[PDB]
Amino acid sequence: MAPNTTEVEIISEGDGKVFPKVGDTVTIHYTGTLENGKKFDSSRDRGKPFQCTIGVGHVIKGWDIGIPKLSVGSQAKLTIPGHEAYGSRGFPGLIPPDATLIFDVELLGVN
Amino acid sequence: MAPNTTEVEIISEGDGKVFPKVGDTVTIHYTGTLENGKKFDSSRDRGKPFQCTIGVGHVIKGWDIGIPKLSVGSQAKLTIPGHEAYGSRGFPGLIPPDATLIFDVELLGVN
């Protein structure tokens, strides 16, 4: 029983003032795991926040949905169902078909 | 200058008799690299052929295009442009946006 759509749970509150909007560059730290807790990717392990354009389909749909809910400084958990992640394709070797993904994300900057 | 669409180059010929069709299960070995030769995934490293349904969007588009050209026993190189692979999303940590992917594939079985 995956979610119907991406769930956002803010763990630690950010500044409450600066939120991403469509087309912004976000600088974020993330760790992504499967429902069984197996990690498949983490910017924290690379020692370097990830940077991407939000809201324009340059990241998985669940990120486009959830990351704009965060203010800068927020830490949140995103629970993303398969159809807003990698779907039936998954990612061979790492992510099974139709996998719900769990992302622990920290928003460090908006441009 | 990526290809306009997926290129297939058969390196070693298969049996010339058994080809995948839409909806079949293919059992394949693959190694996938970026244009710079950096490997990002390989079933050969897992010691176990990959199995998937072909022609129904359960794998990247370039595989749906190219794998049905192979007969069982064939070894081929697929050169897949970004828009038939992971597109501008890529796969964070492994595959950059708009990346052309190179797959060395061996078709071991069709069901």
Side-chain angles (χ1 to χ4, degrees), chain A residues 58 91, chain B residues 1-7 32-40 60-63 78-103:
Chain A
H58 289 192
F91 189 89
Chain B
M1 259 298 301
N4 281 317
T5 181
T6 290
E7 287 157 12
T33 61
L34 305 180
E35 299 221 85
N36 60 29
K38 184 192 132 232
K39 167 202 307 182
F40 60 82
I60 58 169
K61 183 69 188 168
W63 278 16
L78 311 201
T79 302
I80 305 174
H83 62 92
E84 290 167 0
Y86 294 97
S88 58
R89 280 163 221 215
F91 189 89
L94 282 177
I95 297 168
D98 304 311
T100 298
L101 309 186
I102 306 286
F103 282 96

Side-chain angles (χ1 to χ4, degrees), chain A residues 30 40-41 46 50 56-61 63 85-86 88-95, chain B residues 30 40-41 46 50 56-61 63 85-86 88-95:
Chain A
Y30 69 90
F40 60 82
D41 179 29
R46 301 191 286 276
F50 187 69
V56 299
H58 289 192
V59 289
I60 58 169
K61 183 69 188 168
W63 278 16
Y86 294 97
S88 58
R89 280 163 221 215
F91 189 89
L94 282 177
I95 297 168
Chain B
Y30 69 90
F40 60 82
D41 179 29
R46 301 191 286 276
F50 187 69
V56 299
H58 289 192
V59 289
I60 58 169
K61 183 69 188 168
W63 278 16
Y86 294 97
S88 58
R89 280 163 221 215
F91 189 89
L94 282 177
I95 297 168

